[PDB]
Symmetry: D3
Subunit: 291 residues, 6 copies
């Protein structure tokens, strides 16, 4: 961005205005995962972008996953896994590992990255201040609902405390573990949890960073990619899509149906993708709205 | 900004970060005048840029002049002028006109322009809530200090009220008229007034929009333009410069010497010049710092 | 008030009590116009009376007109007028003049007068902070609704901001210009605007200073003057009254019907008329209440 | 105040302005005693005047005595008194009576009188919330310092709590009893206590209602009455005055020397004397200032 | 509590937890009377217990009676009483005595006792700040409703002010006198008043200190004492009980039916009975709940 | 605590008062470690005791270690250690493990335990919101200062944010990791960190739970145990004591010398030891004060 004429730099900065006005003082929940988490230039830029939102008076909330880091730690520890369908059964032991990795490893590096720009990030789980609870979930293998241990869905959210934390100028970085009604901590799918937090906080937008250009309807037809889609149309398309896009799309559906004005599936492999989706009309992501 | 690749749009937006962090929650006083006031694309962009600062949680304060509009109104009214040196004598009558034009005409269009983006601008003079007072000033013709009527300098500033007004999320647009100790309203040079407001409010930056590329030391040598200069060096250069740059430079000197971290002389003829000077490293303006 | 016995001075001050209790912490909107605006002893006393209300913890709001000052300025500028019925057509040019005179001249002298007693007054139009909007109005000539340019009625009122401004201890002085939904500033009849502001702010009282002893029913029978009247009775009488009293009475009707507890038509030619109408049982004005 | 012309009523109300501005938001401590306490028209008007100050956003604080009511109750109870010089010795028994009469009788009627105008008054002693402490005082009989039991001076004042109570819009009515450092409640001279409260609260004025026209220097020469006097001059005159004026004058000296801008000895036998001393230039009282 | 093993001291302190959690930040109204008022060890411990609740962030409110102290003062003053049934007729004179004794004597000693632990207590009646009003009540002699003078029931309660007073960290000590709608102060039965205050303040608990082990159903069968009872059952039992327990039980009924979660009749003759009823499972009192 | 007479239960609860008054609204920092962390009855009671302090309006802050859990995890992961003197060298790898175990395992169980009583606990490190920084420390082996990797001391503490967090009613549970000036996270000795937090927060008390009866001067003479000691005396004794007591004593010295009123070494093996040390005069711990 050196040889680029100044008057076009001015135009790029000015074209941001309408979205600065749309998001000022608003909550934006961001699911962070995929390559945007593993490559150092992309993660450093993701951190700077969170600092950006905060220094525009926007209120980012970061929800993170970390599936592959968990299995690697379990393999390091020699913890033999049990599998039903494609799912590992989350025994009390896998959870102590899951929690320890998500919160004590993955969340910490993001906190430190963001905090390179200032005293902003704060890590939390649903355990802290009872910020959210979990309810045990089942999954379905070959059409049968089946138990795979201490996994669940976000049950209820301490909306008050949480919103406090962000008015103080803080960026929570959430690791998706929370207690159930009996105090038993469960692991929650990070995508679904992000949609739940977004809905409960009255978020203006939910962004889902993924390793895709965007929602393809008839993958892999190039002509099948779409910029925008409504819940009704997307819900009908849901049984058609690949394994990896189902949770991302399900989250977008529950968020937007829950009242979040729009959810976005954006490409985490693009540097500063969040700046592109939020402050530019040129994002390759796909925007979900109600209808 | 259409055919421009997205990844370079992302970089333009990201390169803004460090200045967003420098100015967040800070007061920036802007002298608005020159062509940036008379051409409609430049004024519309100046207004949008004020909306921009506000929607980044920055606190712009706008000080405006309007010399040529005053003389035109005086000519329309058939008010014969009296002149000492190059100065019109500001009789009680010229002031009723000056005040009426500055506050009832020039300030109003800027307020309305800015307010096209939201309920932000509010017009004021030193008369309103006793926000600032004036002290009668003399000027010097042929080395003699001489009286030219009801003109003066900013005397004291109601720093408390003023800072209130901006925490409420408002953008004051100041017309440089204020009462003296006896209630007698004077007209204040808009440049000097901008430096006074900036100093009294603890402004982070003072920007002076002018009709120049920047400070030339040996005008019109092209090689004489400078990007940055300190107060000591600039003060010595002061007797050398053209008539039109003296007030702009004097303001920068008193502001920065008064503790304002930097004052900037930027080109009001560039669209969105303020966005360029604040969020980009490519401004043609000249930055003044202490030393 | 020198030779007057002290014990009767004490009684005058004490008889104020019940109205001090009725208005303490309450909004009182005052239409200021007529002779109370043009003679210097009456205007100086009107200003002191506003200072009085403020220094009793009452919240005065001042709405002003200025019809004759506008036409004089238009005549000074050689602006040829166009007239339908008795109305001047408010072209874009007449408005730049109207706004400039109302806000840059008439409002300023009242602000300065009031501010001789302290940092109280602040001038505003509906343009400032989007405090109120306008909607274009027509008038009726010979029973036909007809367009006379950029004149209108108060459309909606930023009740929140406004009420803020007065809790801060400020006395707004309103010039009746406001933007329409498209940003186009209109001139609003000061009487009607005063009733609109009073209703929107939950004012306890609306006072209309006029050049009359009070409402005469069968002018000019001396026996026809009344101290108090209800909306129903007054509405029926409306088609009967002189040209000059119609707007004053219409305002009182819409205010009191809008829920303002009482509106008052008081004589602006009496020194300190507002002190008389508010803190004394001896006013010649006429009080309007609902029924 | 019926046949009195309206324009002179207006002037009486307007002449109040400068003192409304001097006292707005300020603390005024009032010693209440003498006839102003015993005649029902004077007490009712004293109560209304406290309501007046409160409904002008002034902060009255009322300190009361009640010497004669105490002795009457002691006589009713058959409590034989012991006397040194002219002083009754305040045994533990006389105090239970003193406290009971001051706080449970005299303070209550004033509270109820004031509260006829609204929920304003609140009775207190130094015992409540530890609002002020006492220190045992001696008196001097025939030049010997002597002990007369549980009487004392205001020692320290809980300035914080107290000032709170008045910002809430309340009018404390103080009965001059307070604990010493050991919890032992003492009776405090109401005059001296009023000066102590006034000084500790940063009162703008202290008023002492007495049964005199004002301070006579050479009583009973009519020509000896004075409108104003300074501390130095008054302190020298102190040994000259009658028994009854010594405490009133001593209080004025300690208050004004303590920084209270002025103390006033006003005639409690004049209806609404406080309104006269505060809002009129015609008071017969005598004003004390420093010098 | 010296030779007692430490590990059992630890258990006593720990068993308090669940009630500390139930009452934290909650209002607890306490009727104080009986022996707990007359013996010095019991009263000193009652005071310390109020200090305890306050230093746990609990909000005690103390309502006190004082029947026997009133009659003793009336006998000291030679005030001949008039009696209908078992009731003294409360003439205007008996009230001046009643008020003076309750507020100027009985309330003061409790305030001073409590305040030995800090600046907590503050005495009040319904007269102060119009905190509550009274309505004249009749009583029934031989089945006839009859007038016995200036006695009444709590009519309405200034819930706002009151709750303020306790958030400030204060412990009000209420003497049951209040004005009626016309300003005429009445004496209110302290038991009934305590139930009214408890209901109006949303108290978590109402405690009634009495001179009984607890509610006996078939007094004096030892086997008839009960630990807990519901309103329906207790209401039916009401006509059966002794004269002294009727008001205590009536208060418990109106409180719990008014929504107060539980009312308790506890033994005022046990040192620190309130600590026992609140923080221990071993109280001899009887708890009333709805049903 | 069943057969124990009620009147002695009442005395145990009442004897707590003076310490409830000393600590109300005050910060108490607690080092938690040793057996109090490993046995389930002791940890459950430690959690309940934190809930206790919080439900008395006290502000507990919990600092925890976890040395043995770290080495066990390192052994599980097959991480070969390097040792200088008795110290493991904290390589970047040992820290990822240390942080993960302290924050993602040990801190979580305490948070969940405490949160069984309510939404109180919140886990943090110095990384979160930049709450505290670290400075690399060396240790001394055989009298030589030597480097053992990423270990350090608390450098500076974000006192503001922190104190906020506790006013909100939260109990922070601190894991002793923090960034240095360059963002490089270090592991901090939990004892020293507890003294640093206590000093920086103006804590009223610092408690150090250890596996000792208390400070023995001449261990293992039974007669050598002491209840209280001053800094000067204790500092001189420091070179004499066992390896395990040095850090506990050093922390007490720096805390009390830093202005913390008293530090306490209490026996973590006693159930509810904190309740015993704080609310009882029977603790076996040893209290440190300045002198
Ligand atoms: O909302 C406001 C607050 C303040 C305040 F001064 F109270 F901050 N001032 C305002 C003004 C003024 F600046 F002219 F006063 C004009 C319009 C709205 C205002
Ligand atoms: O609302 C109140 C506040 C305060 C406060 F002290 F908190 F300001 N004090 C009050 C009192 C007291 F002055 F006796 F305390 C008595 C009645 C009402 C009160
Ligand atoms: O509600 C909160 C406020 C603050 C605040 F720092 F704003 F006080 N911090 C919180 C934290 C943090 F301590 F990690 F920051 C974690 C969970 C909830 C918090």
């Amino acid at each position: 961005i050196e040889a680029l004429p100044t008057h076009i730099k001015a135009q790029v900065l000015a074209e941001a205005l309408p979205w600065l006005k749309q998001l000022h003082g608003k909550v934006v929940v961001v699911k962070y995962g995929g390559n945007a988490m593993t490559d150092d230039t992309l993660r450093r830029a993701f951190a700077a972008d969170m600092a950006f939102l905060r220094n525009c008076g926007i209120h980012p909330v970061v929800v993170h996953g970390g599936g592959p880091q968990i299995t690697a730690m379990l393999r390091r520890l020699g913890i033999e896994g049990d599998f039903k369908g494609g799912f590992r059964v989350t025994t009390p032991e896998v959870l102590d590992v899951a929690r320890m990795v998500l919160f004590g490893q993955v969340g910490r590096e993001l906190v430190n990255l963001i905090n390179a720009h200032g005293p902003y990030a704060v890590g939390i789980t649903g355990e802290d201040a009872q910020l959210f609870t979990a309810v045990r979930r089942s999954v379905t293998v070959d059409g049968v609902a089946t138990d795979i241990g201490l996994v669940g869905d976000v049950d209820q959210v301490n909306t008050a405390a949480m919103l406090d934390l962000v008015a103080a100028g803080r960026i929570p970085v959430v690791s998706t573990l929370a207690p159930d009604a009996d105090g038993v901590v469960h692991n929650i799918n990070a995508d679904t949890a992000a949609a739940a937090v977004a809905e409960a906080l009255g978020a203006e937008k939910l962004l889902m960073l993924t390793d895709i250009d965007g929602l393809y309807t008839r993958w892999p037809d190039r002509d099948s990619l779409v910029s925008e889609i409504d819940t009704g149309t997307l819900a009908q398309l849901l049984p058609t899509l690949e394994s990896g896009m189902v949770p991302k799309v399900e989250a977008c559906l529950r968020a937007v149906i829950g009242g979040v004005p729009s959810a976005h599936i954006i490409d985490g492999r693009v540097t500063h993708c969040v700046l592109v989706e939020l402050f530019t009309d040129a994002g390759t992501g796909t925007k979900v709205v109600r209808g």
